[PDB]
Amino acid sequence: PEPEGPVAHRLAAVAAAIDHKLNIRKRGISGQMRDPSLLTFQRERVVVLSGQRFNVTVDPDGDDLLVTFDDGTTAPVRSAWRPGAPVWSGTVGDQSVAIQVRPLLNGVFLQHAGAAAEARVFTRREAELADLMPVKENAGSGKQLLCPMPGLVKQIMVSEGQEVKNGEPLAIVEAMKMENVLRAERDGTISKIAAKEGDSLAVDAVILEF
Amino acid sequence: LEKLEERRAQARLGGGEKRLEAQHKRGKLTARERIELLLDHGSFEEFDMFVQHRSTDFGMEKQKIPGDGVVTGWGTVNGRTVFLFSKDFTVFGGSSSEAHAAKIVKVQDMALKMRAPIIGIFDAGGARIQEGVAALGGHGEVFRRNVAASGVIPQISVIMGPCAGGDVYSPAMTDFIFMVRDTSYMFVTGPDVVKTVTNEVVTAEELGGAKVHTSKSSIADGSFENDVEAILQIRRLLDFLPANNIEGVPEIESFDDVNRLDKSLDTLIPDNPNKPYDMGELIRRVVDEGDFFEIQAAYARNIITGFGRVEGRTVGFVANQPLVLAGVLDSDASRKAARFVRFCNAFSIPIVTFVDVPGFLPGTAQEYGGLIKHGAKLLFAYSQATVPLVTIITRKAFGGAYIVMASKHVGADLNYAWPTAQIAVMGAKGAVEIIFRAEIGDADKVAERTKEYEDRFLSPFVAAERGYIDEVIMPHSTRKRIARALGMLRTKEMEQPRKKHDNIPL
Amino acid sequence: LEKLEERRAQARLGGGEKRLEAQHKRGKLTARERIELLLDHGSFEEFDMFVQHRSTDFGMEKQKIPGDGVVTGWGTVNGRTVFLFSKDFTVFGGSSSEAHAAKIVKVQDMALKMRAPIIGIFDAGGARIQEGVAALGGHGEVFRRNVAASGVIPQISVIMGPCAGGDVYSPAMTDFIFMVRDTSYMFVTGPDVVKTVTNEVVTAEELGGAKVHTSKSSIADGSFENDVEAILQIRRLLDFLPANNIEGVPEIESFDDVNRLDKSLDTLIPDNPNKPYDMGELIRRVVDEGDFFEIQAAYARNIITGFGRVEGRTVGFVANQPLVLAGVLDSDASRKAARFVRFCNAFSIPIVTFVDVPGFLPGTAQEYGGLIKHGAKLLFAYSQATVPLVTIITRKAFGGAYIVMASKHVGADLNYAWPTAQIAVMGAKGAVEIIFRAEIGDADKVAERTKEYEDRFLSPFVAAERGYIDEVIMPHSTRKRIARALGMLRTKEMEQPRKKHDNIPL
Amino acid sequence: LEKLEERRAQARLGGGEKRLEAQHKRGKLTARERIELLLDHGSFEEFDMFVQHRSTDFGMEKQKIPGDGVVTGWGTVNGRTVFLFSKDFTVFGGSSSEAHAAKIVKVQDMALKMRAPIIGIFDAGGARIQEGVAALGGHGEVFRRNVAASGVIPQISVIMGPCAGG
Ligand SMILES: CC(C)(COP(=O)(O)OP(=O)(O)OC[C@H]1O[C@@H](n2cnc3c(N)ncnc32)[C@H](O)[C@@H]1OP(=O)(O)O)[C@@H](O)C(=O)NCCC(=O)NCCS
């Protein structure tokens, strides 16, 4: 479920705070043409939270941060979180919070109060240009499990008539004195099993059908 | 003058409002938008906005378009100077002409002169046919300069559209090639000639798409979802790399500690020698903040290559991967790792290697394909390196593979080993079957001899007794030791013999 | 003293009368006989005749044989100094031990110090198992020195028996590998493991015999009938080659005349555009005395590479071959030519190229195999060269292939063209198909436009009018022109930019 | 082919019979005769005989003469290597254009690369007006190379007619 109300606002504020810390650190790289103390940081930001745009402004106060939304609402943000740690524990607007943080390309994945969301922080122009990008569909797998390496079947776990989720271990194929676990890349039921424990397979051979 | 402002406003429209709208409808950015997203705000200085072509054949004189199909100039990325060019698909399909090529040559020469990186963005169709041989000349002059810049400044290419014909050989001589999924492709000869000559029917996606070039062909170093993601990742990559072959790696303030211990690593190697583990976990625990930029992640997955940071300085990583093909060395993996090691040595980046290797891949396919030379490539790369080299053996190291993976014998500076390391000529079974060839008639003597061979030689202590290993360390100390060694080794100075160049095998 | 002559006579026997007679029964010479045939009479000085191994495991302390399985030393070939080593198959199967490796290292070091060539003769079985990891260490020290010597002194390898396992990676890093038919073979992993792992049954000849490595794998530069033929051909090769990367090519007194014309060359090119001809004929008519030493003859026969002499000085030759795949460039040919060009440039040998190329080879097999980088290897090699380059276009030069084949744009010094040359972006049919895409329906207009395009553009004169060709010459003048140009270009001075090394694709 | 020797003979005439006889009437040799006198017998190798200009202004596209007004190449003097160029007064008054300048630049570069002397023979009237600023560019590229060669290879100049402006 995607967040709502104060939860979503707290998540967006934490996202902005993380982005600000990282930009500050980034701007200290060696080898620059002139001193960075003479450059400016843009105050207006767009937090995108699994398709829910928040226009915000970020301002440092004391040693902590202040994030202002369009409603005039304000949220101060304070924490001692550092990159690498898996938990952001701090204060957002007179409420202590703990949030699970994971990384992803150009942003983070955040979990809080049973809600989960991808989070990306842009400038206005970056957001305008990102809104020109399409939403692409996934093709999906092809109804059957094919052996990607030649080897010997060591163990088949699932049974016929068995619905499966992703990451489900299905079989083990040993080759060159090393086990290899095969997993489900889709969801569905096991119709029939074509391979027996102890068999020997070639590349692109069929093990089971969905 | 208002009129000059109008001249500029008209140059900025390329080949028309309709063509730009069609580009947008395909889900693709324009040349100038790409330049805008790559560089720091307000830093872009453009060269040669008003350049026009001078061809008079086949009616070309009636359509002169300012810029001639490429946008060129310079700016800053995170404060550091970079040069760049971007091809405009809306002008004669981004095809290269004489003046177009002259613009590219201008920025290439300036970048070599200033000793700064150069980024090329490709969305093109090759040599403009209406101009004939002159067009080809242009390509040549670009190629030459690519070759002059190799090992002096980093050269990055981004494929965001079609790239066909002579256009493909310029990215091929650069250091890294990145692609966008579902809108880009590369090939030398296109589907029509393929149909007429080979009778095979094939789409462009099938012939030269992102999947082909990231998983099967060895050409592309990675792929991305769309243009915005890709340009943001190029910005990320530029912050790891040296500006040139003199200045050394950039430095940043790290949020991590160098004296921290990692207890979990003490349980990463399984008791059963038949069960694998994920070497990527080790790498992502050793680097600062868990941040790792992987190179050729979808190709030859039996080996891992990429960039991380230690104490805020860039470090390259090579590692065997047991999860795929039992971590063996084959031709593909060897070539992958060899190019990476050569780049890092050329630009003075230190290298850390993690070793778990049982041997090479057997079969007629490998031998007929040229494994002798392909394998020799990696050995050559390591033996030639003068940067610091730190190697850590986790579990297996047998035979020639042990020598190839940054051993002390080929020039490594420091060589550690975990307690689970097994450094030997080969496995106990085969060693016994060879040494005791005229005794295999029995079954119990066989087991006894195999057990005693295991006890004596399948360990790290013979190599330690000979000094091939500097220390056997506990796993939890890995990071702490690496960070210390690298520090000490920053002052290494060594040089190879004098020569025009080596004769590394191809 | 008699005792010392007795100990010498006893060290010369190696592993015993019986094993030596059995070697003779296989049709093979001994190590010392090989040395005796290679070197000038009376010239051999041997090192380290009495060396012995120091292992005490598996009873080895009871079989101590002086020399430890390899003969090492120095001598002269046609009066010029050379260093050499020869493995002895009778002693522990020619296997490499610690002291064995130290013997090879002594002569490698000496060859680098003296700046003289080194020849290695291989009849062996790899790392000696009983000595364990120590043996591996040995191999490493050899490998490193190979890499240090690359591009400083020429290194030649002769495979006159088995060569398996680690033994293969040393010859792979040398400049030339030659093999003897039906008694030699090379492979990383042997047939037994191949059976255990892939279930396929193959003989040693089928896995790594001379046919495989001279026609399929890209490993070997040539094969010979027997040992005597091979060694005499090595003596022939050495006379062409420089002694190091400073002294330049050797000179001999020629019996030919540099001012002779050849009228028959005015009829070599057929009138029918679809009929081929033999470029080897041209090469063999242009060199002194018709004498030409070909390299990689049996592999990628759509291109020719080899050594000849002009005015008594060595010259390298690269040529397209219309007889095979219409002379197109593919990946195999590009690799074959790139290695040769790089070797020539390293040791200051000038290069002459003969061009007749319609393009690259189309298809999924080529693109999936990585043509984009393989074809770039050759472009990189020519663009990087600082030696004299002379190019002659005979019939066709289309597209990017024209650029790659030593064009003026990539750095050629002199560029000539015969009267039958066609220098163009592509053939007329496709050119007008593309340009006149909105009029393809008709059939008279198309033929008229094709004829007009052929008349205007498929000639050497547009390239001549732009200065891309320095002169259009008569075929019968070819030799006379080449010899003159080379004479003038001997004083050429040029340098690449300063760098540790390039980052050529691999 | 015979057509090729015909093309050669037609390039050796420059601006025509009448202009050549006028040059002789003034007591002046031709550019090619001057080359023949300077170099050893049978040693001259010519570069870029068929080069043409690419201007389309002021009716210039109707008069394209092979060589573009300069003869360039190399040879020997008393057995020693030399490079040279000679301007032809019968072709636009030996005026300098883009391709003209490119030919001269080629021989300058070669002379520096092989470390041999270079001789320039001058009979000319400067930058070709019809070509505009492009012509000036040519002059520039020549100037720079002179400076690069100073103190490295000897450079000799012979003025055998007019030599004005640039
Ligand atoms: C680059 C290419 C793959 C792009 O394919 P595409 O996206 O389907 O689009 P198009 O080919 O129709 O190209 C866009 C325009 O650029 C022009 N263009 C493309 N490549 C060109 C080239 N090398 N020279 C000149 N013009 C070129 C095309 O004529 C076309 O013009 P139009 O819209 O005005 O009619 C393809 O055109 C191509 O392969 N070009 C190379 C030249 C060639 O050999 N083409 C023949 C086979 S397509």
Ligand SMILES: CC(C)(COP(=O)(O)OP(=O)(O)OC[C@H]1O[C@@H](n2cnc3c(N)ncnc32)[C@H](O)[C@@H]1OP(=O)(O)O)[C@@H](O)C(=O)NCCC(=O)NCCS
């Ligand atoms: C080199 C080789 C290809 C030659 O095979 P071959 O001509 O059929 O002959 P053999 O194997 O009988 O070898 C000749 C001798 O050298 C010995 N030898 C060969 N390679 C050796 C090595 N690496 N270490 C120690 N001794 C070795 C053999 O044991 C044999 O001695 P023997 O006559 O005393 O029994 C093969 O021996 C080999 O592959 N050696 C590598 C080691 C190995 O893995 N052997 C097992 C596969 S057979």
Ligand SMILES: CC(C)(COP(=O)(O)OP(=O)(O)OC[C@H]1O[C@@H](n2cnc3c(N)ncnc32)[C@H](O)[C@@H]1OP(=O)(O)O)[C@@H](O)C(=O)NCCC(=O)NCCS
């Ligand atoms: C070189 C020069 C001194 C020769 O004087 P001259 O022998 O009396 O002869 P001309 O001036 O008649 O020149 C010979 C031809 O070369 C042409 N020519 C000379 N210099 C030229 C130039 N720079 N650009 C183009 N054409 C030129 C003239 O047009 C004339 O052509 P034409 O005889 O077919 O009509 C003179 O032409 C000159 O000064 N040119 C330099 C450019 C200039 O500023 N000239 C202004 C008019 S003098």
Ligand SMILES: *C(=O)CCCC[C@@H]1SC[C@@H]2NC(=O)N[C@@H]21
């Ligand atoms: C047991 O089955 C022995 C065969 C497997 C040996 C493995 S296969 C890949 C490695 N390379 C090699 O030669 N030996 C190792």
Ligand SMILES: *C(=O)CCCC[C@@H]1SC[C@@H]2NC(=O)N[C@@H]21
């Ligand atoms: C006419 O039939 C043209 C088709 C064949 C063209 C040949 S195939 C190999 C060369 N490469 C290329 O692109 N065209 C040439």
